[PDB]
């Protein structure tokens, strides 16, 4: 029937507009949200295409300096620090805050204050 | 029944679980990103209904304790800390890290290390 055709044509149009509305809203909110986390925490977090979290400090001394963390499994949030070039330069923060205190927040907080206090005008 | 109707039924089905697998993928990912940022930085970061940013520490003493930041300007990101019942209790940290150093990362870092050090092991 032409009644089915007209009704189904609205439904196609309607679903296609919801998808466009969904995509453009999401894209806007994640970019604001990801920029919000960077300005506040001083870490750019990005989900690496191997589903791991790459962290870059706002106060990184070199470009390419970064930390990589691996989720143990979807259930809960325990994560492992992976080897990066930058990881080798903070064995003492790792010992004190990750092995002894078992706190990634304490670690990232200690690192941030360390990098921030090294960032001088001259 | 008719080809033109049969085809339009495929097109709605296609657009239905194009949006429906769009929402369920946004949801898993947003929650994964937000959870990683919880475990790593020790802050739950919400977008409020007023499009402001609420931060609750993993080491919060009371469950409603939070910091609210507003985006001052669209261009890049400067942020103003707004007044909460909990912001009242950290004027010391606000003076050193927000007023003088002008670093939200340095502030949140200090705050995480202060709250983390209050956690009893018992």
């Amino acid at each position: 029937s032409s009644k089915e055709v007209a009704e189904l044509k609205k439904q196609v149009e309607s679903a296609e507009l919801k998808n466009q509305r969904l995509k453009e809203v999401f894209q806007t909110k994640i970019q604001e949200f990801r920029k919000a986390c960077y300005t506040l925490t001083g870490y750019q977090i990005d989900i690496t295409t191997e589903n791991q979290y790459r962290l870059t400090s706002l106060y990184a001394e070199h470009p390419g300096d970064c930390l990589i963390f691996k989720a143990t499994s979807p259930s809960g949030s325990k994560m492992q620090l992976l080897e990066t070039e930058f990881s080798h330069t903070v064995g003492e923060l790792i010992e004190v805050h990750l092995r002894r205190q078992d706190s990634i927040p304490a670690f990232l907080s200690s690192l941030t204050l360390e990098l921030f206090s090294r960032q001088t005008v001259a | 029944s008719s080809k033109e109707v049969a085809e339009l039924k495929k097109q709605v089905e296609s657009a239905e679980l194009k949006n429906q697998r769009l929402k369920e993928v946004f949801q898993t990912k947003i929650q994964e990103f937000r959870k990683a940022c919880y475990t790593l930085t020790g802050y739950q970061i919400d977008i409020t209904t007023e499009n402001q940013y609420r931060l609750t520490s993993l080491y919060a003493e009371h469950p409603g304790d939070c910091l609210i930041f507003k985006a001052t300007s669209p261009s890049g990101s400067k942020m103003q800390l707004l007044e909460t019942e909990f912001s009242h209790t950290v004027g010391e940290l606000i003076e050193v890290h927000l007023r003088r150093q002008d670093s939200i990362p340095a502030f949140l870092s200090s705050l995480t290390l202060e709250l983390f050090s209050r956690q009893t092991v018992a």
């Binding site: 999401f26 970019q31 690496t48 | 296609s14 679980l17 697998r21 993928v25 946004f26």
Partner: peptide, 18 residues
């Protein structure tokens, strides 16, 4: 996966890096 999942995964993953 199935095709629409993959189409969905393509769009989102782009924005969770840079």
């Amino acid at each position: 996966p199935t095709v629409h999942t993959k189409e969905a995964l393509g769009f989102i993953m782009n924005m969770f890096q840079a």
